[PDB]
């Protein structure tokens, strides 16, 4: 399970305006909301055979194609299906939170998230020390997926040109070159239809 | 071990220019270098009784005061001692990498890192789902530690005013208010002497 180059698909989802929300809600509520959210979103990943790499604050990092082998087309099919399922689950989560006066009330709006997906080469395996290590992916490909997530609009799914090669033309909303932090050359991005 | 408010100290260390280095070095070398680095840096954390929260790419997140209770003064003493020990270990790591032509040669410079340390309230405990959860800290206090790391110069240690309350005046190099992403009010920062 040592680190080696591999073609994988990385998905990043990140809650919109979690900072403000993490101030207008008691620590008790913030913890419950975030965990209820993470529970449903990780379910979306697992049900689509993805791997939950880690959580980073209000974000979820998911991998497709590692550790288990997966074809390039299936990696994309599953990652997009995951993102679309996450949005569906979110709509249901907010209905419940609304009734519990956890969102929509006071100054905390319904939860929304941004999602970026990129497919490319990465060094994947166990990183860390003998005392503490974790399976993850390293390389510019991971940075790209993260910048796509940060660049896209709330409740939207932005993917790279690589990922878009496997997506029907009818499902591509917008094609646009963007300058992503850390990457020299402009990156072609495609916002895809959020509906399953 | 459920999430609850707690006064803790968060330390973030992040490799300078890892992107460029993660391109001028074969995936094999990048993986070895990063793991050798992580091995020595996590050792610094553990030997100073800190907790390794997680790794985020080229960064290490460490906590002091959770899960094990620790006084505010000891949290700071240990976090700073950790940062200072990390710099010392780095100097030794580069000597070895230099001899192995892993750094200093071609276009890959000796490894350097940025470090930010902040102490404050955070909701700490297990976050995630029944299927996958991890012990971590959540809240603006964590964002502050991360922004201090990003704001400081290579091979330097930047801490917040809270942390500086426990640091001798002779060890404070520079005091300066900085606008950190995500935080409304300006944050008072203090760059501390890197030598043990
Ligand atoms: N538990 C954690 N583990 C690791 N890094 C963390 C962290 N919590 C925070 N950080 C770091 O602090 C940064 C900001 O934390 P957010 O991600 S919770 O907040 P935002 O999404 O930027 O804010 P928004 O736009 O209002 O939703 C993270 O990116 C991490 O680098
Ligand atoms: N394994 C991983 N797990 C989680 N997030 C990751 C990741 N790898 C990358 N990211 C995300 O991608 C971002 C950039 O990756 P870097 O941290 S390796 O690179 P830099 O430090 O910004 O570059 P530098 O200035 O040249 O040293 C991370 O902050 C994460 O949000
Ligand atoms: Mg967010
Ligand atoms: Mg975030
Ligand atoms: Mg870095
Ligand atoms: Mg980094």
Tab-separated table of C-alpha atoms and ligand atoms in Angstrom:
chain	number	residue	atom	x	y	z
A	1	UNK	CA	0.000	0.000	0.000
A	2	UNK	CA	3.071	2.206	-0.428
A	3	UNK	CA	2.802	5.560	-2.273
A	4	UNK	CA	2.843	5.260	-6.066
A	5	UNK	CA	1.663	7.261	-9.101
A	6	UNK	CA	-1.914	6.510	-10.063
A	7	UNK	CA	-4.751	7.976	-12.114
A	8	UNK	CA	-7.530	8.906	-9.696
A	9	UNK	CA	-10.475	11.214	-9.237
A	10	UNK	CA	-10.604	13.577	-6.272
A	11	UNK	CA	-13.787	15.233	-5.022
A	12	UNK	CA	-13.926	18.079	-2.517
A	13	UNK	CA	-17.156	19.415	-1.006
A	14	UNK	CA	-17.065	22.394	1.357
A	15	UNK	CA	-19.849	24.139	3.294
A	16	UNK	CA	-20.609	27.703	2.195
A	17	UNK	CA	-20.214	30.355	4.906
A	18	UNK	CA	-19.483	27.931	7.715
A	19	UNK	CA	-17.527	30.642	9.548
A	20	UNK	CA	-20.544	32.898	10.128
A	21	UNK	CA	-22.716	29.889	10.910
A	22	UNK	CA	-20.094	28.672	13.388
A	23	UNK	CA	-20.697	31.853	15.396
A	24	UNK	CA	-24.459	32.389	15.283
A	25	UNK	CA	-25.071	28.864	16.581
A	26	UNK	CA	-24.205	27.449	20.004
A	27	UNK	CA	-21.239	25.063	19.989
A	28	UNK	CA	-23.766	22.332	20.774
A	29	UNK	CA	-25.792	23.063	17.647
A	30	UNK	CA	-22.769	23.575	15.403
A	31	UNK	CA	-21.438	20.167	16.432
A	32	UNK	CA	-24.769	18.420	15.857
A	33	UNK	CA	-25.397	20.093	12.510
A	34	UNK	CA	-21.909	19.382	11.196
A	35	UNK	CA	-22.057	15.735	12.267
A	36	UNK	CA	-25.544	15.218	10.851
A	37	UNK	CA	-24.271	16.770	7.637
A	38	UNK	CA	-21.099	14.656	7.559
A	39	UNK	CA	-23.139	11.543	8.227
A	40	UNK	CA	-25.322	12.049	5.163
A	41	UNK	CA	-22.505	13.231	2.890
A	42	UNK	CA	-20.157	10.353	3.749
A	43	UNK	CA	-23.077	8.016	3.083
A	44	UNK	CA	-23.308	9.476	-0.417
A	45	UNK	CA	-19.609	8.741	-0.930
A	46	UNK	CA	-19.742	5.158	0.361
A	47	UNK	CA	-22.937	4.249	-1.511
A	48	UNK	CA	-21.146	5.309	-4.698
A	49	UNK	CA	-18.061	3.242	-3.837
A	50	UNK	CA	-15.839	6.218	-3.190
A	51	UNK	CA	-13.274	6.441	-0.415
A	52	UNK	CA	-13.539	9.107	2.276
A	53	UNK	CA	-9.974	10.397	2.486
A	54	UNK	CA	-10.540	12.832	5.344
A	55	UNK	CA	-12.540	15.799	6.625
A	56	UNK	CA	-10.897	19.231	6.736
A	57	UNK	CA	-13.046	21.462	8.893
A	58	UNK	CA	-16.304	21.886	6.949
A	59	UNK	CA	-14.960	19.936	3.969
A	60	UNK	CA	-14.983	16.330	2.822
A	61	UNK	CA	-12.261	14.878	0.622
A	62	UNK	CA	-13.183	11.784	-1.382
A	63	UNK	CA	-11.157	9.568	-3.688
A	64	UNK	CA	-12.208	7.281	-6.538
A	65	UNK	CA	-9.723	4.790	-7.948
A	66	UNK	CA	-7.797	4.173	-4.730
A	67	UNK	CA	-7.100	2.052	-2.842
A	68	UNK	CA	-9.405	-0.106	-4.992
A	69	UNK	CA	-8.771	0.001	-8.740
A	70	UNK	CA	-11.476	1.686	-10.822
A	71	UNK	CA	-11.630	2.529	-14.532
A	72	UNK	CA	-11.268	6.196	-15.513
A	73	UNK	CA	-14.873	6.304	-16.722
A	74	UNK	CA	-16.291	4.692	-13.587
A	75	UNK	CA	-14.264	7.030	-11.355
A	76	UNK	CA	-15.997	9.981	-13.004
A	77	UNK	CA	-19.433	8.353	-13.103
A	78	UNK	CA	-19.262	7.620	-9.373
A	79	UNK	CA	-17.768	10.958	-8.297
A	80	UNK	CA	-20.423	12.936	-10.167
A	81	UNK	CA	-23.204	10.639	-8.931
A	82	UNK	CA	-21.859	11.275	-5.410
A	83	UNK	CA	-21.931	15.068	-5.841
A	84	UNK	CA	-25.463	14.952	-7.222
A	85	UNK	CA	-26.659	12.697	-4.414
A	86	UNK	CA	-25.066	15.040	-1.848
A	87	UNK	CA	-27.129	17.976	-3.156
A	88	UNK	CA	-30.310	15.886	-2.957
A	89	UNK	CA	-29.548	14.857	0.642
A	90	UNK	CA	-28.791	18.466	1.531
A	91	UNK	CA	-32.275	19.565	0.450
A	92	UNK	CA	-33.718	16.968	2.835
A	93	UNK	CA	-31.332	17.887	5.668
A	94	UNK	CA	-32.358	21.546	5.517
A	95	UNK	CA	-36.066	20.715	5.721
A	96	UNK	CA	-35.392	18.974	9.008
A	97	UNK	CA	-33.049	21.680	10.294
A	98	UNK	CA	-35.606	24.336	9.325
A	99	UNK	CA	-38.275	22.631	11.451
A	100	UNK	CA	-35.770	22.467	14.314
A	101	UNK	CA	-35.045	26.164	13.910
A	102	UNK	CA	-31.401	25.351	13.236
A	103	UNK	CA	-31.360	27.167	9.886
A	104	UNK	CA	-33.383	29.796	8.054
A	105	UNK	CA	-34.112	31.301	11.453
A	106	UNK	CA	-32.081	34.078	13.122
A	107	UNK	CA	-29.139	34.807	10.833
A	108	UNK	CA	-28.166	31.240	9.835
A	109	UNK	CA	-29.265	30.425	6.257
A	110	UNK	CA	-29.992	26.928	4.887
A	111	UNK	CA	-26.796	24.947	4.392
A	112	UNK	CA	-25.183	25.000	0.948
A	113	UNK	CA	-21.884	23.570	-0.288
A	114	UNK	CA	-19.391	23.950	-3.118
A	115	UNK	CA	-18.003	20.910	-4.919
A	116	UNK	CA	-14.960	20.474	-7.132
A	117	UNK	CA	-13.953	17.309	-8.991
A	118	UNK	CA	-10.740	16.614	-10.883
A	119	UNK	CA	-9.194	13.494	-12.383
A	120	UNK	CA	-5.470	13.126	-12.931
A	121	UNK	CA	-2.181	11.664	-11.753
A	122	UNK	CA	-1.379	11.682	-8.049
A	123	UNK	CA	0.958	9.821	-5.703
A	124	UNK	CA	-1.440	7.772	-3.587
A	125	UNK	CA	-0.722	5.637	-0.536
A	126	UNK	CA	0.153	5.894	3.156
A	127	UNK	CA	1.846	9.108	4.247
A	128	UNK	CA	3.100	9.991	7.713
A	129	UNK	CA	5.311	8.100	10.149
A	130	UNK	CA	5.389	4.654	11.717
A	131	UNK	CA	3.607	6.219	14.697
A	132	UNK	CA	0.887	7.952	12.650
A	133	UNK	CA	0.095	7.633	8.938
A	134	UNK	CA	-2.964	7.998	6.679
A	135	UNK	CA	-3.909	6.947	3.162
A	136	UNK	CA	-4.195	10.008	0.933
A	137	UNK	CA	-3.241	11.498	-2.427
A	138	UNK	CA	-0.519	14.076	-3.051
A	139	UNK	CA	0.242	16.312	-6.013
A	140	UNK	CA	-1.066	19.250	-8.101
A	141	UNK	CA	-4.075	17.124	-9.107
A	142	UNK	CA	-5.355	17.347	-5.547
A	143	UNK	CA	-4.739	21.111	-5.420
A	144	UNK	CA	-6.734	21.498	-8.632
A	145	UNK	CA	-9.789	19.684	-7.243
A	146	UNK	CA	-9.632	21.961	-4.175
A	147	UNK	CA	-9.338	25.155	-6.216
A	148	UNK	CA	-12.296	24.131	-8.376
A	149	UNK	CA	-14.344	23.711	-5.209
A	150	UNK	CA	-13.340	27.172	-3.979
A	151	UNK	CA	-13.989	28.772	-7.381
A	152	UNK	CA	-17.492	27.489	-8.009
A	153	UNK	CA	-20.841	28.935	-6.899
A	154	UNK	CA	-22.770	27.696	-3.828
A	155	UNK	CA	-24.603	24.398	-4.519
A	156	UNK	CA	-22.837	23.863	-7.850
A	157	UNK	CA	-20.445	21.206	-9.139
A	158	UNK	CA	-17.326	22.310	-11.029
A	159	UNK	CA	-15.091	19.748	-12.741
A	160	UNK	CA	-11.957	19.849	-14.907
A	161	UNK	CA	-11.713	19.252	-18.651
A	162	UNK	CA	-10.404	15.755	-17.894
A	163	UNK	CA	-13.562	14.899	-15.955
A	164	UNK	CA	-15.759	16.602	-18.577
A	165	UNK	CA	-14.493	14.194	-21.259
A	166	UNK	CA	-16.845	11.605	-19.718
A	167	UNK	CA	-19.820	13.919	-19.290
A	168	UNK	CA	-22.577	14.292	-21.921
A	169	UNK	CA	-22.587	17.657	-23.710
A	170	UNK	CA	-26.162	18.231	-22.553
A	171	UNK	CA	-24.976	18.119	-18.946
A	172	UNK	CA	-22.283	20.791	-19.301
A	173	UNK	CA	-23.628	24.177	-18.213
A	174	UNK	CA	-20.523	26.298	-18.672
A	175	UNK	CA	-16.975	25.883	-20.008
A	176	UNK	CA	-14.399	28.419	-18.825
A	177	UNK	CA	-10.646	28.790	-18.324
A	178	UNK	CA	-9.738	29.832	-14.790
A	179	UNK	CA	-6.484	30.772	-13.105
A	180	UNK	CA	-6.209	28.483	-10.096
A	181	UNK	CA	-3.816	29.237	-7.240
A	182	UNK	CA	-0.669	27.142	-7.487
A	183	UNK	CA	-1.106	26.131	-11.128
A	184	UNK	CA	0.837	27.942	-13.847
A	185	UNK	CA	-1.261	27.296	-16.954
A	186	UNK	CA	-4.940	28.308	-16.961
A	187	UNK	CA	-7.244	25.391	-16.125
A	188	UNK	CA	-10.296	24.606	-18.264
A	189	UNK	CA	-13.303	24.173	-15.988
A	190	UNK	CA	-16.810	22.897	-16.617
A	191	UNK	CA	-19.810	23.495	-14.391
A	192	UNK	CA	-22.098	20.467	-14.702
A	193	UNK	CA	-25.863	20.067	-14.302
A	194	UNK	CA	-26.629	19.440	-10.594
A	195	UNK	CA	-29.713	17.318	-11.272
A	196	UNK	CA	-29.508	13.544	-11.366
B	1	UNK	CA	-15.277	12.019	23.796
B	2	UNK	CA	-18.160	13.962	22.249
B	3	UNK	CA	-17.581	17.478	20.824
B	4	UNK	CA	-17.510	20.232	23.449
B	5	UNK	CA	-16.080	23.752	23.855
B	6	UNK	CA	-12.537	23.763	25.170
B	7	UNK	CA	-9.529	26.063	25.428
B	8	UNK	CA	-6.776	24.569	23.279
B	9	UNK	CA	-3.687	25.445	21.303
B	10	UNK	CA	-3.488	24.621	17.606
B	11	UNK	CA	-0.237	24.459	15.645
B	12	UNK	CA	0.022	24.294	11.864
B	13	UNK	CA	3.288	23.723	9.988
B	14	UNK	CA	3.333	23.769	6.185
B	15	UNK	CA	6.169	23.159	3.709
B	16	UNK	CA	7.227	26.191	1.667
B	17	UNK	CA	6.934	25.785	-2.113
B	18	UNK	CA	5.929	22.140	-2.033
B	19	UNK	CA	4.114	22.566	-5.359
B	20	UNK	CA	7.267	23.311	-7.368
B	21	UNK	CA	9.183	20.656	-5.454
B	22	UNK	CA	6.393	18.165	-6.167
B	23	UNK	CA	7.158	18.562	-9.877
B	24	UNK	CA	10.951	18.708	-10.090
B	25	UNK	CA	11.255	15.445	-8.156
B	26	UNK	CA	10.168	11.967	-9.250
B	27	UNK	CA	7.036	10.700	-7.495
B	28	UNK	CA	9.327	8.191	-5.786
B	29	UNK	CA	11.510	10.924	-4.308
B	30	UNK	CA	8.613	13.206	-3.395
B	31	UNK	CA	6.999	10.368	-1.450
B	32	UNK	CA	10.210	9.471	0.383
B	33	UNK	CA	11.077	13.069	1.221
B	34	UNK	CA	7.595	13.898	2.480
B	35	UNK	CA	7.436	10.767	4.635
B	36	UNK	CA	10.923	11.283	6.051
B	37	UNK	CA	9.880	14.842	6.832
B	38	UNK	CA	6.567	13.808	8.409
B	39	UNK	CA	8.347	11.186	10.471
B	40	UNK	CA	10.667	13.717	12.089
B	41	UNK	CA	8.027	16.428	12.509
B	42	UNK	CA	5.444	14.128	14.114
B	43	UNK	CA	8.205	12.962	16.448
B	44	UNK	CA	8.666	16.574	17.534
B	45	UNK	CA	4.943	16.782	18.298
B	46	UNK	CA	4.766	13.523	20.264
B	47	UNK	CA	7.949	14.168	22.262
B	48	UNK	CA	6.355	17.435	23.388
B	49	UNK	CA	3.098	15.697	24.339
B	50	UNK	CA	1.079	17.228	21.546
B	51	UNK	CA	-1.558	15.406	19.532
B	52	UNK	CA	-1.192	14.976	15.778
B	53	UNK	CA	-4.657	15.885	14.520
B	54	UNK	CA	-4.014	15.157	10.850
B	55	UNK	CA	-1.847	15.880	7.812
B	56	UNK	CA	-3.236	18.070	5.025
B	57	UNK	CA	-1.005	17.640	2.010
B	58	UNK	CA	2.342	19.173	3.023
B	59	UNK	CA	0.963	20.357	6.368
B	60	UNK	CA	0.760	18.981	9.887
B	61	UNK	CA	-1.983	19.974	12.305
B	62	UNK	CA	-1.222	19.517	16.000
B	63	UNK	CA	-3.323	20.061	19.101
B	64	UNK	CA	-2.344	20.757	22.708
B	65	UNK	CA	-4.954	20.469	25.441
B	66	UNK	CA	-7.032	17.730	23.821
B	67	UNK	CA	-7.950	14.987	24.249
B	68	UNK	CA	-5.736	15.128	27.358
B	69	UNK	CA	-6.229	18.146	29.620
B	70	UNK	CA	-3.335	20.618	29.722
B	71	UNK	CA	-2.990	24.011	31.416
B	72	UNK	CA	-3.046	27.100	29.181
B	73	UNK	CA	0.598	27.838	29.987
B	74	UNK	CA	1.782	24.293	29.306
B	75	UNK	CA	-0.144	24.180	26.016
B	76	UNK	CA	1.858	27.183	24.830
B	77	UNK	CA	5.166	25.985	26.275
B	78	UNK	CA	4.811	22.646	24.482
B	79	UNK	CA	3.530	24.018	21.165
B	80	UNK	CA	6.388	26.514	20.905
B	81	UNK	CA	8.946	23.909	22.003
B	82	UNK	CA	7.530	21.679	19.240
B	83	UNK	CA	7.896	24.389	16.575
B	84	UNK	CA	11.456	25.126	17.661
B	85	UNK	CA	12.383	21.447	17.678
B	86	UNK	CA	10.878	21.047	14.187
B	87	UNK	CA	13.197	23.751	12.810
B	88	UNK	CA	16.206	22.051	14.416
B	89	UNK	CA	15.244	18.672	12.915
B	90	UNK	CA	14.724	20.304	9.530
B	91	UNK	CA	18.316	21.576	9.483
B	92	UNK	CA	19.479	17.991	10.041
B	93	UNK	CA	17.069	16.548	7.457
B	94	UNK	CA	18.367	18.886	4.754
B	95	UNK	CA	21.994	17.934	5.398
B	96	UNK	CA	21.079	14.343	4.649
B	97	UNK	CA	18.898	15.219	1.658
B	98	UNK	CA	21.676	17.449	0.302
B	99	UNK	CA	24.137	14.534	0.375
B	100	UNK	CA	21.527	12.397	-1.392
B	101	UNK	CA	21.091	15.085	-4.028
B	102	UNK	CA	17.423	15.364	-3.101
B	103	UNK	CA	17.633	19.104	-2.395
B	104	UNK	CA	19.908	22.024	-3.205
B	105	UNK	CA	20.626	20.282	-6.491
B	106	UNK	CA	18.748	20.882	-9.767
B	107	UNK	CA	15.949	23.330	-8.991
B	108	UNK	CA	14.752	21.936	-5.631
B	109	UNK	CA	15.912	24.115	-2.702
B	110	UNK	CA	16.428	22.928	0.898
B	111	UNK	CA	13.113	22.303	2.633
B	112	UNK	CA	11.631	25.125	4.709
B	113	UNK	CA	8.281	25.427	6.481
B	114	UNK	CA	5.923	28.042	7.885
B	115	UNK	CA	4.379	27.632	11.329
B	116	UNK	CA	1.392	29.297	12.957
B	117	UNK	CA	0.220	28.825	16.548
B	118	UNK	CA	-2.967	30.091	18.168
B	119	UNK	CA	-4.685	29.409	21.477
B	120	UNK	CA	-8.405	29.877	21.978
B	121	UNK	CA	-11.832	28.288	22.252
B	122	UNK	CA	-12.759	25.488	19.873
B	123	UNK	CA	-15.309	22.674	19.752
B	124	UNK	CA	-13.144	19.571	20.088
B	125	UNK	CA	-14.123	15.920	19.791
B	126	UNK	CA	-15.105	13.285	17.232
B	127	UNK	CA	-16.595	14.582	13.993
B	128	UNK	CA	-17.901	12.543	11.077
B	129	UNK	CA	-20.330	9.632	10.928
B	130	UNK	CA	-20.716	6.259	12.605
B	131	UNK	CA	-18.929	4.801	9.575
B	132	UNK	CA	-16.019	7.274	9.620
B	133	UNK	CA	-15.123	9.892	12.237
B	134	UNK	CA	-11.968	11.646	13.487
B	135	UNK	CA	-10.980	13.642	16.554
B	136	UNK	CA	-10.391	17.270	15.599
B	137	UNK	CA	-11.115	20.880	16.532
B	138	UNK	CA	-13.615	23.182	14.833
B	139	UNK	CA	-14.105	26.937	14.943
B	140	UNK	CA	-12.512	30.303	14.030
B	141	UNK	CA	-9.635	29.526	16.418
B	142	UNK	CA	-8.467	26.813	14.043
B	143	UNK	CA	-8.809	29.123	11.024
B	144	UNK	CA	-6.679	31.708	12.822
B	145	UNK	CA	-3.816	29.268	13.458
B	146	UNK	CA	-3.913	28.332	9.752
B	147	UNK	CA	-3.899	31.940	8.555
B	148	UNK	CA	-0.951	32.753	10.815
B	149	UNK	CA	0.949	29.885	9.213
B	150	UNK	CA	0.160	31.178	5.720
B	151	UNK	CA	1.045	34.771	6.650
B	152	UNK	CA	4.463	34.194	8.163
B	153	UNK	CA	7.869	33.995	6.459
B	154	UNK	CA	9.592	30.696	5.549
B	155	UNK	CA	11.200	29.025	8.605
B	156	UNK	CA	9.518	31.400	11.060
B	157	UNK	CA	6.983	30.907	13.849
B	158	UNK	CA	4.022	33.295	14.077
B	159	UNK	CA	1.665	33.178	17.064
B	160	UNK	CA	-1.374	35.151	18.243
B	161	UNK	CA	-1.531	37.695	21.060
B	162	UNK	CA	-3.120	35.009	23.246
B	163	UNK	CA	-0.102	32.737	22.796
B	164	UNK	CA	2.304	35.676	23.209
B	165	UNK	CA	0.959	36.335	26.723
B	166	UNK	CA	3.058	33.343	27.839
B	167	UNK	CA	6.179	34.245	25.880
B	168	UNK	CA	9.047	36.314	27.348
B	169	UNK	CA	9.367	39.813	25.870
B	170	UNK	CA	12.932	39.013	24.820
B	171	UNK	CA	11.615	36.235	22.589
B	172	UNK	CA	9.141	38.386	20.648
B	173	UNK	CA	10.693	39.570	17.385
B	174	UNK	CA	7.770	41.485	15.922
B	175	UNK	CA	4.250	42.522	16.963
B	176	UNK	CA	1.828	43.387	14.161
B	177	UNK	CA	-1.903	43.508	13.426
B	178	UNK	CA	-2.855	41.491	10.356
B	179	UNK	CA	-6.087	41.015	8.450
B	180	UNK	CA	-6.636	37.267	8.314
B	181	UNK	CA	-9.066	35.703	5.844
B	182	UNK	CA	-12.348	34.812	7.513
B	183	UNK	CA	-11.859	36.965	10.610
B	184	UNK	CA	-13.567	40.353	10.855
B	185	UNK	CA	-11.414	42.200	13.389
B	186	UNK	CA	-7.673	42.570	12.739
B	187	UNK	CA	-5.621	39.921	14.552
B	188	UNK	CA	-2.562	40.861	16.617
B	189	UNK	CA	0.324	38.603	15.621
B	190	UNK	CA	3.747	38.032	17.130
B	191	UNK	CA	6.703	36.461	15.367
B	192	UNK	CA	8.771	34.633	17.991
B	193	UNK	CA	12.480	33.794	18.180
B	194	UNK	CA	13.067	30.471	16.352
B	195	UNK	CA	16.008	29.436	18.533
B	196	UNK	CA	15.529	27.155	21.510
C	1	LIG	N1	-10.733	20.764	11.625
C	1	LIG	C1	-9.859	21.298	10.781
C	1	LIG	N2	-8.820	20.490	10.271
C	1	LIG	C2	-7.891	21.068	9.385
C	1	LIG	N3	-7.857	22.324	8.949
C	1	LIG	C3	-8.895	23.070	9.470
C	1	LIG	C4	-9.915	22.642	10.365
C	1	LIG	N4	-10.757	23.621	10.661
C	1	LIG	C5	-10.274	24.674	9.955
C	1	LIG	N5	-9.164	24.387	9.234
C	1	LIG	C6	-8.347	25.297	8.347
C	1	LIG	O1	-8.891	26.655	8.389
C	1	LIG	C7	-9.418	26.974	7.041
C	1	LIG	C8	-10.739	27.662	7.218
C	1	LIG	O2	-11.661	26.804	7.941
C	1	LIG	P1	-12.981	26.344	7.257
C	1	LIG	O3	-12.671	25.414	6.062
C	1	LIG	S1	-14.185	25.464	8.575
C	1	LIG	O4	-13.681	27.675	6.798
C	1	LIG	P2	-13.989	28.089	5.288
C	1	LIG	O5	-14.600	26.960	4.476
C	1	LIG	O6	-12.718	28.620	4.587
C	1	LIG	O7	-15.020	29.275	5.453
C	1	LIG	P3	-16.398	29.491	4.731
C	1	LIG	O8	-16.080	30.112	3.400
C	1	LIG	O9	-17.184	30.486	5.546
C	1	LIG	O10	-17.172	28.211	4.585
C	1	LIG	C9	-9.565	25.624	6.345
C	1	LIG	O11	-9.540	25.744	4.917
C	1	LIG	C10	-8.426	24.875	6.879
C	1	LIG	O12	-7.254	25.237	6.144
C	2	LIG	N1	-3.457	15.256	0.746
C	2	LIG	C1	-4.260	16.310	0.834
C	2	LIG	N2	-5.337	16.274	1.746
C	2	LIG	C2	-6.189	17.392	1.825
C	2	LIG	N3	-6.115	18.521	1.125
C	2	LIG	C3	-5.044	18.509	0.254
C	2	LIG	C4	-4.090	17.471	0.057
C	2	LIG	N4	-3.189	17.795	-0.858
C	2	LIG	C5	-3.569	19.038	-1.246
C	2	LIG	N5	-4.671	19.499	-0.607
C	2	LIG	C6	-5.387	20.817	-0.781
C	2	LIG	O1	-4.746	21.597	-1.841
C	2	LIG	C7	-4.150	22.804	-1.220
C	2	LIG	C8	-2.789	23.001	-1.818
C	2	LIG	O2	-1.958	21.834	-1.577
C	2	LIG	P1	-0.653	21.978	-0.743
C	2	LIG	O3	-0.988	22.343	0.721
C	2	LIG	S1	0.436	20.316	-0.850
C	2	LIG	O4	0.159	23.118	-1.459
C	2	LIG	P2	0.549	24.525	-0.816
C	2	LIG	O5	1.104	24.400	0.592
C	2	LIG	O6	-0.653	25.495	-0.831
C	2	LIG	O7	1.658	25.066	-1.804
C	2	LIG	P3	3.073	25.659	-1.467
C	2	LIG	O8	2.849	27.104	-1.119
C	2	LIG	O9	3.901	25.595	-2.725
C	2	LIG	O10	3.756	24.912	-0.356
C	2	LIG	C9	-4.078	22.485	0.271
C	2	LIG	O11	-4.045	23.668	1.079
C	2	LIG	C10	-5.287	21.684	0.475
C	2	LIG	O12	-6.404	22.568	0.617
C	3	LIG	MG1	-16.598	26.438	3.847
C	4	LIG	MG1	-13.508	24.904	4.284
C	5	LIG	MG1	3.079	24.412	1.464
C	6	LIG	MG1	-0.129	23.339	2.268
